[PDB]
Amino acid sequence: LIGTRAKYGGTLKNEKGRRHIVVCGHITYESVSHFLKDFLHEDREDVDVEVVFLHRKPPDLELEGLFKRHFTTVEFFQGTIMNPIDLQRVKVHEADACLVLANKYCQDPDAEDAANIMRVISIKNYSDDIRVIIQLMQYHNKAYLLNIPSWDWKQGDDVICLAELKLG
Amino acid sequence: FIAQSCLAPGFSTMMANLFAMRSFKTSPDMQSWTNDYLRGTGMEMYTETLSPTFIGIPFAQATELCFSKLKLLLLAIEIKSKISINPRGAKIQANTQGFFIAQSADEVKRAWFYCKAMKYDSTGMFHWSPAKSLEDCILDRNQAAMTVLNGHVVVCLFADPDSPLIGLRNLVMPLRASNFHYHELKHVVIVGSVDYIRREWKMLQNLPKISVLNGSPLSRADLRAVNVNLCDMCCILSAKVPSNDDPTLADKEAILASLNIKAMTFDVYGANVPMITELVNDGNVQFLDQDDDDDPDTELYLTQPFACGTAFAVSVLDSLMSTTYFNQNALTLIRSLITGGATPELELILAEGAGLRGGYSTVESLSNRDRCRVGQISLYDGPLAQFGECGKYGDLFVAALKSYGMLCIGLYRFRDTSASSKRYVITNPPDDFSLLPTDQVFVLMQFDPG
Amino acid sequence: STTYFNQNALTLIRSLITGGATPELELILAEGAGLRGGYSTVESLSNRDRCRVGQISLYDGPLAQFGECGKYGDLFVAALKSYGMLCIGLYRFRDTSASSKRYVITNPPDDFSLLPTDQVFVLMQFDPG
Ligand SMILES: [Ca+2]
Ligand SMILES: [Ca+2]
Ligand SMILES: [Mg+2]
């Protein structure tokens, strides 16, 4: 009943002249490790951008070890993007961009797309001038995002449609 | 409540707050519009026996005297027994029970301690039609595009063919009350799956001016066909069962439909389209508006979308059962106010199972058409526009009562006076309240034959 | 990850693989009425002039001379001047001695040796007529 104190919680510490991005959605060991290998590659330009991960379920032992090896550049927080309190904790309004990972191996692509679309609505509700990049499963769900009043491709909002790209 | 909001936007917020018991005390410093709205939320409805001094005077003089002297709003009385809302030329009898809007039950005690020192149905309360079939009411995009639809009501329906039935008749009948002339009746167009509406057509056969458009309200092509930019009110309702996977995903379709219309552009923006949305989860009201601060444990009635008459939920109706126990007549007044008049005899006929039954108009049947109705007026122009320039609620209330018998209940005032077209509800402002030229007044207007 | 660092990178991919999908086209599709036709105008026929993904063979033709000797740099320059085609890579047989399987070589060096049975990925211009 006493249990253990919440290992992942609290607010992200603010730093002067610091750039960070928020990554949400399908946060697993395989998805995070693959994303971090591509994001932090010494073949590309050196930029001081740290990744902040937000997820509901606590990470397993494998994921916790991965975060330890990237202690100086990767931060994890427990919470949901649909909670305005959790958006304040990760400082979404100060983030360079928000990335919404998708579960490509999902039983219902429509259900997965609906959940991710609501995440974009929650982020845009908190603030309108935040760049959002979201992985989409089906093309017919792209119309919903385009009809959002705060969605603007000019400002950097992008939709990565797996169905459109794969069949292309 | 949704149907009454079509005639007067924001009425659902005003009525819902009336029967939720809240205690209001002035805060030290906060937003001026929040303070004005919070004062209105503290008003409830109370029943008190009228003083013997009121015996022998008409209702219009009785409610005017209560407002000016006792600072109480009297809107209905009990006549031996039926309840009349803002009656015209009705005298006050001995021990007459009156309905008052006041901050608490201690205020209404001032009233007692006062001294000088085939066109219509069988009941004749609703319009009737000779059972039009559903097939004749089905329109496609081309049919809806080439017909004029101005000032109509669009019902955006999200429902699977196997979804549980909602009371779609309970939304159209208040719009088909005998208080409205046939020419001023608002056309109702339902956008949704015909398979679901087919099960609901049994109670909609005899209601005039009903159109059904197959498709989904999310598509912009269907919305442009029915001219949502010219509609008087767009209602978004969902009859689908909740998957219970996540509370934040329960209102995904309703939120998306609301946002789609807001970003719509017509050759006039879609953000000016009056919209009402019902939420199966009151915590999803944070996504309805963008220019506000959302906090999870804030009550629904304190949120900006609810204060503006944009959102609605069934959680605000939980206080009705406590109200009903203390005063049975309180529930009768609510039902007569929002259903357009639903006498117990009408419910007996409906309980038979033959649907709405018409009747031949008689001498008294046309007299049932003479009753007050919920309406909204604007102070921008007209004989009452003089009070908007200077600004005094007490002067406007008295002048409207004498000139036409209209009873002012509250105000629909712009949130910002400097630039968003959002208006919030102020219920029963004090007589010293300052009006504005861009203010709208909730009124109970009498029936004018002709 | 690529899209975040450069938004224009995703734009290049979409224009390369979708045949050209302007944001205005997506707006029309989002309405729900499907693909909408239009009457050809002066500029509308000028939108047809853009590069497309194609494959060519060195077995025969004016460019077949480079296949016999073999030099990627010489083939790249000659194709660019003669027709404006830009060579991206090669489609070369896995075994040169017997299976009809070809693998992809992306941007080989200019000193790479070609073969008569080599196929070249090119971006060929639009030729009216
Ligand atoms: Ca109170
Ligand atoms: Ca909000
Ligand atoms: Mg109250």
Residue numbers in the entry:
A (entry chain D): 339 to 506
B (entry chain B): 507 to 586, 594 to 630, 778 to 927, 959 to 1109, 1114 to 1145
C (entry chain D): 1013 to 1109, 1114 to 1145
What text appears in the publication on this structure?
These BK (“big potassium”) channels are synergistically activated by high intracellular Ca2+ concentrations and a positive transmembrane potential. The pore domain is surrounded by four voltage sensor domains (VSDs) that move within the membrane according to the transmembrane potential, thereby inducing a conformational change in the central cavity that changes its accessibility for ions. In addition to this transmembrane domain (TMD), Slo and its homologs feature a large, domain-swapped intracellular gating ring, which senses intracellular Ca2+ concentrations.
Therefore, we heterologously expressed and purified Slo from Drosophila melanogaster (Dm) and determined cryo-EM structures of the channel in the Ca2+-bound and Ca2+-free state. Expectedly, the structures are very similar to those of the human and Aplysia homologs, confirming that the overall architecture of the channel and the gating mechanism are conserved between metazoans. Ca2+ ion binding to the gating ring locks the RCK1 N-lobes in an outward-facing conformation. This rearrangement is transferred into the pore domain via the linker between helix S6 and the RCK1 N-lobe, and the C-terminal end of S6 adopts a kinked conformation. As a consequence, the entry to the central cavity is wide and hydrophobic patches along its walls are buried and K+ ions can access the selectivity filter and be translocated to the extracellular space. The binding of Ca2+ to a total of eight binding sites leads to an expansion of the gating ring. As it is directly connected to the pore domain via a short linker, this conformational change also causes the TMD S6 helix lining the central cavity to adopt a different, active conformation which allows easy access of K+ to the selectivity filter. Two potential binding sites in the gating ring were only identified in the Ca2+-bound active state as they are lined by residues of the moving RCK1-lobe on the one side, and either residues of the same subunit or the respective neighboring subunit. This pocket, termed RCK2 pocket, changes its shape upon the Ca2+-induced rearrangement of the gating ring.
